[PDB]
Symmetry: C8
Subunit: 182 residues, 8 copies
């Protein structure tokens, strides 16, 4: 008798663990990031950092005046239980500064929410974790509750918005400070 209830309990347990790992594998997170360059300067040397998740495509090397970044990052495949969270940065040699854009689309919406930010750092810098913790904690991010606007200095500003869901769209326009948004 007794080994039959052990094998039956083993099949019940793998029935639970199969459904658990198939749920965590089918819970999806992504952020379609559009950054639109109305700045009047060429961006170059495009770099990216992921705290969580990844892209399949490359970021483009450069954005000319009036062109856009259109970049699609997504969470890791399989039952990973992490969101998509990262930095995108470009150097702007016409002003000697690097624009960094951050997004955060979490896995668990009880603990976290969608956040985004952008800032214009001094010099040429690669995108890395020190920009993520700054753009997420040391400077005020935005809640994904519609459109927001902020100055960058050097005659620049941005306006942008993010959708509040796990399939997110982030849209930013980087503009001259003297001009109307969108």
């Amino acid at each position: 008798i007794a080994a039959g209830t052990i094998i039956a309990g083993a099949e019940l347990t793998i029935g639970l663990l199969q459904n658990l790992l198939d749920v965590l594998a089918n819970v999806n997170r992504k952020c379609a990031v559009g950054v639109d360059n109305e700045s009047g300067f060429r961006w170059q040397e495009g770099s990216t950092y992921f705290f969580s998740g990844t892209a399949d495509e490359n970021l483009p090397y450069s954005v000319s005046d009036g062109y856009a970044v259109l970049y699609g990052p997504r969470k890791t495949n399989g039952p990973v239980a992490t969101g998509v969270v990262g930095v995108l940065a470009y150097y702007i040699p016409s002003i000697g500064k690097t624009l960094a854009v951050m997004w955060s689309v979490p896995f668990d919406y009880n603990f976290y929410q969608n956040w985004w930010n952008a800032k214009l750092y001094s010099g040429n810098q690669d995108a890395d974790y020190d920009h993520y913790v700054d753009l997420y904690y040391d400077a005020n991010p935005f809640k994904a509750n519609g459109w927001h606007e902020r100055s960058l200095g050097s005659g620049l500003k941005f306006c942008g918005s993010m959708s509040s869901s796990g399939q997110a769209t982030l849209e930013i326009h980087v503009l001259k400070e003297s001009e109307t948004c969108m």
Copy 2:
């Protein structure tokens, strides 16, 4: 013998809970919101608040004279048992007021029904919970029973309708007070 009826009862229970969570995951709620700007003024600084549910796309930053918002919010993914309920708001600098539009598509139609409303608040204001409780309780909403019309002051009015189902369409035209609807 006895552990075999415990594992059989465990599989019966997970058979119930699988069918329960698959029912709550496949019960769908959405509201296709169209707001049409026949106002003669440019709307800007678009903001949104969700009491329940979310959008995937962004709301557009601005609506010019004769253009429309076309915005699609939907309930949260998975077995959540909540509807889609929210506010949409734009600033109108030509009059110094913010138009806020509200919809409410509930999960459980025994307790609740489809409602919508719109109002024109003083000053520039972000969309938030204080507009939701006002547009839903402190001002009279509309029952989703065909077309309705109301004045906003400052030479504006709206007419609109909402469908009575869980896949809802809300349509609003915002107009000069002196002009015929649709």
Copy 3:
């Protein structure tokens, strides 16, 4: 032994209740309502009432001379065991009266059959239950057995037909009293 036949009887019972609720969910009722405005007057302020069922789309605000309502109502989703039954009404300010159109596509064809009607009430009135009980009991409805024709007064009449099935099509032409149907 005995608890094994209780769990086997529980699985038999949920096998019955699953097939019952899947039958009631897949039994479908709808009425494609076409109302064609050959009246020579503009209709406006479109309203609708459901005794049973719902639409997904909005009814259009107004119908001009030579245009049509094309409106699709359907029963509630899931295992609800109710048909689609309702009123549609428009105000006609050129004569000071409201045209109301009624349809009734029942769930259970042993007790009920497809019925429709139309009438032209005095003044501006919203579509509601008092028009449903009138158009269904206090005035003679039509059996869905081919084409029928009736005068409305104020120089108007209608002709129309309804198909006899649970996927119904209702077609009405509203005409000048002095003119030939279709």
Copy 4:
């Protein structure tokens, strides 16, 4: 022991009744009825009666000289075990008579076969059961064995055919008596 063979016999019985009702639901009957108006007169006030089965579309109100009825009736949904059997009738005011067309596509081809007929009654009459029993028993119908032809009086005749299967096509041309068929 004994309750286990009762639940096993209950599942065997619902396995039979599921396969029985799925067979009766998937056994399909329909009749694509074409009636072609080479009569030189306008037909109007189109009416229909079903002894068994139904249509989804409406019959058209009128047929002008050289136009056709193209009408699709079918058996009732689900495990109903009845065919499609009915009358179609139009008034012809140029002669003061009503053309009635009958078809009969049975469920059980051991007891029954495909039959059709047409006749030209005096006056304006609605399509009903008294025309069905007449067109099926009191006047000689046609066996669905190729093309047949018959005079109607008032200078009219018809020729037509019906296919011998449960997915039937009925084709009739109504003609001047002095002219060649098809």
Copy 5:
């Protein structure tokens, strides 16, 4: 114990009978019959008889000089274990005779094979069983082994072929006796 092996044997038996009736339902027989009218005479009053099987479409009333019959008959739906076997006949008033075409596509190819024939009978005659037994037994049919040719009298002949399989194609050209086939 014993009733459990009776219910197990009942489920084994319905497992056999399900597979038997699904095999007999999916064994398909059809004959695409093309009869091409190079005769120089109009054919009319088209009739058909089935010993076994049926068509869904109608046979056309008439074939003019240079036109074709293209007619598709098939076995009865479900587990019927019968082939498709029939006669097609037209009257030819220019000579006072009726052309009859026969095909036979059997269910069981151990007992039977594909056969076809055609003959030109005196007078106007409906297609029926007396033509089937004549065209199949009292006159020599053709084996479905490529092209064959035969005179009909009255200045006519035919040439034709049939494919040897259960999805059959029969092709016949009816010609002036003085002219080359195909």
Copy 6:
């Protein structure tokens, strides 16, 4: 106890026989036969014989100068365990001889291989078994190992090839003896 292992062994046996007959039903054999008429003579009275397998389409009655036979034969449906093997023959009245083409695509490639042949017999002859045994045993066939060429007499030759698999393509060009192949 004992009848339960008999019913379990019966279900095991029908599990084997189902998989056996589904394997023999899904093992497929066909030969796409192209015969290209560069002969300078019209071929006519096309005939065919199958030792094994069948076609669905008809062979064409005649091939004119520069036209092709394109003919598709295939094994019998269901679990038959036989290949496709046959003769195709046409009469050539310009020389008083009949061209016969043979192919053999076997079921079991341990015992057999793909073979083909062609020969030009005296007089008008129907395609039959005496041509099959001649073209397969009494004259040397070709192994399906690329292109081969042979004279026919009367100023004709052929060149052709066959693919070595169970989905076979046979291609033959029949040519004047004085001309280059393909």
Copy 7:
């Protein structure tokens, strides 16, 4: 008791053998062979030999100056556990020699790897096993590691490459010795 564990072990064994034969049936091998004729001579009398595997299409009889062989061979259907390995040969009468091309795409990549070769033999020769063992062992083949080049004598050379996988592409250009590859 004991016969129940024998039938359970029989079903376990056929569960293994079903999965084994379905794995060996779905492991696929093919070689898309392109041979491009920049030689300045016409190739003719195309022949082929398979050590393992087969083609469905025919090899073309001849390749003119500037045309290509495009030939697709593949392993045998079902659970055969053999790769695709063969020779292709053409006669070149302008020089009195036959070009033979060899490929080898094995089943088991632990024992074997992709190999290919080509050589220009004296006289007209059919493709056979003596060319396979020569092109694979008696002359040095190429490893499928990118592009390779070799002289053939008579003023010819080739360059070619093969991909390293079980779905292989072989590309060869046959050229004048005095000219640049691809």
Copy 8:
């Protein structure tokens, strides 16, 4: 009793091993490698080496001025638990050096990450393992964290990027040293 729990444990074990090998078979790795030739020199004699994985297509023999390599390598089919890792190399006779490009897309991202590199070796050299260990360990590779740039000598440089995921895209532009990237 006891053999029944052994066969039940055997089926549990093959249930685990089936799910294990189906997971390792459906975990996919690939690298879409684009190498863009803005060098002003023709590349030729294209070669490739795989440490792990394979391509289906061939690498092109040569790249002219302004053309691109577009090459798709992928991991081995089935449950192999290895990534895709390799070298691509071309000779550049205008400078007497060979460009080698390396990528590494690992299976297990706990131990490893995406890496790439490129270098310009002296002389004509085939792509092999000595270039892989050099490009991966003896020269500094790049982390797949956005765009990077490096000089090659002989008046050349490259810029490129790689995406950080298991479905990777590698993009490299090879340029004159005096010119701006992308």
